[PDB]
């Protein structure tokens, strides 16, 4: 018999993104080639099958630095990290291939699905 | 020119609640009288003006235990912690006074607003 506040989840994610932009309580650095991205492990896990697996591992859960596969493009990762914290995906003709490949690696099934749909249309 | 995934924020919050239920990456214990509640500092901050102030403090940000004011009712806190992680508020005749008082203390303005509305109706 609960009541529900429709905007609560969106407001929580907006505040988590504000914490990220201000580098507050970030507990991990994701290294993608020469580029570094600070984030919250919990948000990464909530969005990605890959980060979920990494941070539930009894040894990796304690690492402050995670290095991604050298094939991963920093821009594709940046676009996906922004999506994790906002629900908004900056999908463009020039980045769609790198975004799909990064989403497949990160195990972000809904992003992979829309990339496959957008590629099929063109 | 981004696209948006409507269910993303709700799915993120659902996964954060699953992490909470399994005690994964919880980094704080909230003590309310004899009762203890494990949670994620970032989620508490995203939902509460009080926790936002506590964990942005250069000294308190590093505490693993936070003791609430002894006037705070453990059931009211439990109901509010559940709301933080689900968007669902278990508001009942027998708990509304304790929920409103706890929400005022935690600075959860939308919960305070619905409690004031529900009390006014009766």
């Amino acid at each position: 018999s609960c009541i529900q506040f429709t905007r609560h989840a969106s407001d929580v994610l907006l505040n988590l993104n504000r914490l990220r932009s201000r580098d507050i309580l970030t507990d991990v650095v994701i290294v993608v080639s020469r580029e570094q991205f600070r984030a919250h492990k919990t948000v990464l896990m909530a969005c990605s099958g890959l980060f979920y697996s990494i941070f539930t591992d009894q040894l990796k859960c304690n690492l402050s630095v995670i290095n991604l596969d050298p094939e991963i493009n920093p821009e594709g990762f940046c676009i996906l990290l922004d999506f994790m914290y906002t629900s908004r995906l900056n999908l463009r003709e020039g980045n769609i291939m790198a975004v799909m490949a990064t989403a497949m690696y990160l195990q972000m099934e809904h992003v992979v699905d829309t990339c496959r749909k957008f590629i099929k249309a063109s | 020119s981004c696209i948006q995934f409507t269910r993303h924020a709700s799915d993120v919050l659902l996964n954060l609640n699953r992490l909470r239920s399994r005690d994964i990456l919880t980094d704080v214990v909230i003590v309310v009288s004899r009762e203890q509640f494990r949670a994620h500092k970032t989620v508490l901050m995203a939902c509460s003006g009080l926790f936002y102030s506590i964990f942005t403090d250069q000294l308190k940000c590093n505490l693993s235990v936070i003791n609430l004011d002894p006037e705070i009712n453990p059931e009211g806190f439990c109901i509010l912690l559940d709301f933080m992680y689900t968007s669902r508020l278990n508001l009942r005749e027998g708990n509304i006074m304790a929920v409103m008082a706890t929400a005022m203390y935690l600075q959860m303005e939308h919960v305070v607003d619905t409690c004031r509305k529900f009390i006014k109706a009766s």
Partner: peptide, 4 residues
């Protein structure tokens, strides 16, 4: 607020 809604009835979910």
């Amino acid at each position: 607020w809604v009835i979910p």
